[PDB]
């Protein structure tokens, strides 16, 4: 028993409220959407603090955000059971949008209509070349040929799901006083318990170079009664079943002005319904943030010092964490000129209140013991 | 040996019939005279483009460019090309070798200035004051620590090589013979030049504008024949292996331009060598068409039938691919600018054929 989780009311799109986060000046929280519940705070960071974060990130050294895949995907399905899973509309034919909807099949590579049809042509999977695999065409191909194509596929990071470099910065005791003042500022903003905030993932600093992108995704995975949160798991490192990120909130800081592109897109923000049938189509995949940013419902233009933040889950009706909010779908749009620097604070809450409770009060046990 | 046959462009748009296979007719169309640039539609069948792609895929492609690992007043006056006591952005951009494999942009230079705080006033210009209040260590370690994407490199693609000599696939050397009849050159020169290069440009790939051969000095050595070793490619023959859904043109930024002037080529706001940003501003673009071959001369004549200086107008690059993939193959014809070296080289190679 920890008490109800604070969830800020969006009230309506465009609602601005004064908030006091620093004694010096006033800040203003603007509601950008309700689905997902998404806010914006101009000037959350000073120009000096942005430049400090970048420099601390550069001094540590960045690494490729996503490893270049070397293989096909692995997870027990017979070939036809895979067909039945892919054929959403059950017409005996795999349309491009149905293949596109299973991006995990790319095993890290981002699939496009062109990349799919180029693979079809290489392994001769589509004899009549219409972009559709009928049941006969699907059953007529040896999946070993598909595997061999994935094993030898050589492509650039612009063909990945995630195309950026990043690192992490500590914010607890023993860190630069500015890095710790920022954590206290996030704590004062989200009005969550100090335990929750100071136990979440360290600050991630991301550099998008000219040409970088991050196709649209959600920050936290589904909630089953057996899913396991990495932040709450006793073992420092594992490759367990059901491991997932349990990020209650995402706080995103724009560390610089971007000369061209680089927006954050929420493709279905405040859309009346959420329908993957129109999200992913043969001609337009709204998750592609290299091609179709301009068609998403809402974009946030990077502005130095601005923080945007949003909840990744719905409420559950009792003050804790509900299902994931499908509308929190978001990506990093293609950077056309210059580099884009951002930082994100993820607030971790286990969807099981009892499991989170055992993680907090024992993380305090070890501070006393150690 | 005999004088190198150099085809006559006549005028832009001039089209002449040529017979390279006995099946059909080909047509050589002049695209420009500076550089001397031709286009032949349907040079390759749709089946041979599919075979070249299929062959390269099996061999496996490698990343085309690997990511990188005197005084200051010697350096300042060497870059201050207009001698105005300032380093304009265009003057830093003019020396891409300083990027050491990274492509420099106005935004990347100004990003680096602010990192090491070289520009207090932030106007983008490095005064002599600002440039000596500098210290080259910091700049060196900025390049030390710089990690960036392949889209920030000069060359952003993957490639491999396919052999065309004896024992190779019968379709392959049939292309080599077709190239020979097209160029009207000595079988010694063609069959002793580099193997065919197959390049894959992924979506988001590019190759910034460059020339295919280094300058001519009495002390340069051709790799096909290490102090100042450079590539001596007399001709470049480029094959388009697929239709490209978006972008991926070959740009010749200064084709048939009245003069060649790097002051207008590289400016503070527009670098015409940048094939990610400014392809639409170049003089001439070739749209990839499956089967089409384009070819051009990288050197000027010398007036005596051999190889002159580099043709600056041959500057060219691969434009950003916006949708899909772009596959091309290119044949490089190597000729030694010193005819004496080229003569001894192919006559000696004749030894190891009849000796073997
Ligand atoms: C592809 O091919 C094209 C064509 O070949 C080529 O373009 C040429 O590029 C050059 C480089 O960019 C251009 O060079 C300019 O020219 C300006 C002057 O501009 C004009 O005059 C041209 C010549 O005019 C005459 O002759 C014609 C016949 O040839 C005739 O028809 C005309 O009527 C005109 O006639 C008169 O003058 C004659 C004497 O010249 C006389 O005999 C006659 O009786 C009559 O009185 C003219 O052709 C131009 O017209 C074109 O261009 C403009 C602008 O592009 C168009 O709008 C227009 O429609 C025309 O198409 C134009 O009218 C020079 O001032 C300039 O020199 C500056 O820059 C160079 C850099 O190269 C420096 O070396 C030089 O020192 C000087 O520097 C200053 O200025 C620059 C910024 O401009 C700064 O960077 C410097 O720091 C310096 O700064 C200054 O600071 C001072 C104070 O501190 C201050 O005092 C200064 O004002 C300034 O602020 C340079 O030479 C050339 O014009 C282009 N030619 C054409 C035809 O376009 C491309 O470059 C090629 N592409 C590539 C990639 O190579
Ligand atoms: C963000 O939010 C958006 C809004 O919520 C959301 O958009 C919604 O998207 C879905 C899915 O993309 C759309 O669903 C489609 O609707 C089509 C019908 O289109 C018309 O009708 C609807 C509903 O209309 C009535 O009701 C309202 C009130 O509710 C009234 O105001 C209207 O006047 C209208 O009135 C009458 O009808 C009522 C009964 O329905 C009566 O009660 C009443 O009295 C009236 O008589 C309208 O809203 C539509 O308007 C929109 O579009 C038109 C232009 O098209 C605009 O002018 C207009 O302004 C609106 O913007 C429209 O008029 C269905 O046909 C369609 O069904 C097919 O596809 C789905 C999946 O996509 C399948 O489940 C389904 O089985 C159908 O399958 C076929 O067709 C596809 C298409 O090719 C095939 O690929 C497929 O294989 C299948 O094939 C078969 O049929 C084909 C022909 O049908 C044939 O060619 C084949 O050969 C094969 O045989 C689908 O249900 C929905 O309309 C959108 N709503 C709106 C408001 O836009 C969006 O998705 C959200 N975004 C994201 C990312 O989630
Ligand atoms: C980044 O861009 C913003 C947007 O223009 C700049 O903000 C402007 O000017 C003052 C200067 O601090 C700010 O208080 C305003 O909020 C901004 N103007 C508007 C209209 O919003 C900001 O200065 C830029 N930062 C850098 C480092 O270039
Ligand atoms: C690649 O594109 C070219 C040009 O769009 C296609 O060529 C045309 O070929 C058809 C016959 O198949 C002619 O009817 C058109 O007139 C041609 N157009 C031009 C501009 O020459 C070519 O078929 C395409 N190849 C592939 C494999 O898609
Ligand atoms: O880079 C952007 O604008 C989008 N950011 C993210 O998806 C993230 O790192 O959580
Ligand atoms: O990609 C293109 O069209 C340009 N190609 C080249 O510059 C080359 O490989 O020599
Ligand atoms: Ca189907
Ligand atoms: Ca088919
Ligand atoms: Ca200068
Ligand atoms: Ca300055
Ligand atoms: Cl509300
Ligand atoms: Cl890469
Ligand atoms: Fe994200
Ligand atoms: Fe080239």
Residue numbers in the entry:
A (entry chain A): 107 to 181, 187 to 481
B (entry chain B): 108 to 176, 188 to 343, 351 to 481
Q: What do the authors report?
A:
In addition to collagen P4Hs and hypoxia-inducible factor P4Hs, a third P4H—the poorly characterized endoplasmic reticulum–localized transmembrane prolyl 4-hydroxylase (P4H-TM)—is found in animals. P4H-TM is a functionally enigmatic enzyme that is localized at the ER membrane. It is composed of an N-terminal cytoplasmic tail, a membrane-anchoring transmembrane helix, and a unique combination of a Ca2+-binding EF domain and a catalytic domain that is located within the ER lumen. The 2OGDD protein family includes single-domain and large multidomain proteins that are highly variable in their substrate specificity, but P4H-TM is the only enzyme in this family that has EF-hand motifs.
The crystal structure shows that the P4H-TM fold is composed of two well-defined domains: the catalytic domain with the DSBH fold and the EF domain. There are two P4H-TM molecules in the asymmetric unit. The two P4H-TM molecules of the asymmetric unit occupy very similar conformations (RMSD 0.42 Å for all Cα-atoms), and only chain A is discussed unless otherwise stated. Calcium is coordinated in a pentagonal bipyramid conformation by seven oxygen ligands from residues listed in Table 1.
